[PDB]
From Swiss-Prot, chain A:
Tissue expression notes: Detected in primary breast cancer tissues but undetectable in normal breast tissues in Sudanese patients. Isoform 1 is expressed in adult and fetal skeletal muscle and cardiac tissues, with higher expression levels in the cardiac tissues. Isoform 10 is expressed in adult and fetal cardiac tissues, but not in skeletal muscle.
Highest rank taxon of the organism: Eukaryota
Localization, UniProt: Cytoplasm, Cytoskeleton
Part of the full-length chain shown: 121 to 175 of 284
Disease: Cardiomyopathy, familial hypertrophic, 3: A hereditary heart disorder characterized by ventricular hypertrophy, which is usually asymmetric and often involves the interventricular septum. The symptoms include dyspnea, syncope, collapse, palpitations, and chest pain. They can be readily provoked by exercise. The disorder has inter- and intrafamilial variability ranging from benign to malignant forms with high risk of cardiac failure and sudden cardiac death. Cardiomyopathy, dilated, 1Y: A disorder characterized by ventricular dilation and impaired systolic function, resulting in congestive heart failure and arrhythmia. Patients are at risk of premature death.
Function summary: Binds to actin filaments in muscle and non-muscle cells. Plays a central role, in association with the troponin complex, in the calcium dependent regulation of vertebrate striated muscle contraction. Smooth muscle contraction is regulated by interaction with caldesmon. In non-muscle cells is implicated in stabilizing cytoskeleton actin filaments.
Consequence when changing residue 55 to N: In CMH3; no change in homodimerization; no change in homodimer thermal stability; decreased actin binding; recessive effect in the homodimer; increased calcium-dependent regulation of myosin binding to actin filaments; dominant effect in the homodimer
Name under which the protein is recorded: Tropomyosin alpha-1 chain
From Swiss-Prot, chain B:
Family matches, as CDD domains: EFh (cd00051)
Keyword annotations from UniProtKB, A to Z: Acetylation, Calcium, Cardiomyopathy, Disease variant, Metal-binding, Muscle protein, Phosphoprotein, Repeat
MF term (GO), any: calcium-dependent protein binding
Protein name: Troponin C, slow skeletal and cardiac muscles
SMART domains named among the record's database cross-references: EFh
Organism of this sequence: Homo sapiens
GO BP terms in the entry: cardiac muscle contraction; diaphragm contraction; muscle filament sliding; regulation of ATP-dependent activity; regulation of muscle contraction; regulation of muscle filament sliding speed; response to metal ion; skeletal muscle contraction
Length: 55, 160
């Protein structure tokens, strides 16, 4: 029962951890996508800066 | 309005039939015919696009202008052409080369703002002070102040 309760708490916890993990995955991906766009936008302005600097 | 009409005009019969058949997965049956936005990622893949999870979410983020939580059928076609560019034929370089030459009245190898305005006002469509420049800045990828032959071909791919 301790081991079964262990599993119920742990399985639920493992799921909570799976969810927190999924949440960190979603959040890092959103943040990463912000970074993809922040970096993309950076590239657009950095590229434009090069073009504008060249100009 | 007209972007939604145009996406419908640009999809061929063998494609629009798949788009509506797959898009109808958005309603579960015996509901209200809502057609929800969360199902967009699934349909992109059902129709042959191969997006990542970030891309699936971007398609969702770009719809639902009114906060309704749904996607219409014409709205779907507009969102799909911005993801998977299934236009109708999309013409060719030879066809656009001959048409390019018509806007290039002075044979300079590019379309400047005056030619761009004359050709459009000539259609009967009213051209306002900010128009024309808005297209020139779209075709003019190199920021040289005009749309040249190469830029023209990129600019009008998928245009009828």
């Amino acid at each position: 029962d301790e081991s079964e309760r262990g599993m119920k708490v742990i399985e639920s916890r493992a799921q909570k951890d799976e969810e927190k993990m999924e949440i960190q995955e979603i959040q890092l991906k959103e943040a990463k996508h912000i970074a993809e766009d922040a970096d993309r936008k950076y590239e657009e302005v950095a590229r434009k800066l090069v073009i504008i600097e060249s100009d | 309005d007209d972007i939604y009409k145009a996406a419908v005009e640009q999809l061929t019969e063998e494609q629009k039939n798949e788009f509506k058949a797959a898009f109808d997965i958005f309603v579960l049956g015996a509901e209200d015919g809502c057609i929800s936005t969360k199902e967009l990622g699934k349909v992109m893949r059902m129709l042959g696009q191969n997006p990542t999870p970030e891309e699936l979410q971007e398609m969702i983020d770009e719809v639902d202008e009114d906060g309704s939580g749904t996607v219409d059928f014409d709205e779907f076609l507009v969102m799909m052409v911005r993801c998977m560019k299934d236009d109708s034929k999309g013409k060719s370089e030879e066809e656009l080369s001959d048409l390019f030459r018509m806007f290039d009245k002075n044979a300079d190898g590019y379309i400047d703002l005056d030619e761009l305005k004359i050709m459009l006002q000539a259609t009967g469509e009213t051209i306002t002070e900010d128009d024309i420049e808005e297209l020139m800045k779209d075709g003019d990828k190199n920021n040289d102040g005009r749309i040249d032959y190469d830029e023209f071909l990129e600019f009008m791919k998928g245009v009828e």
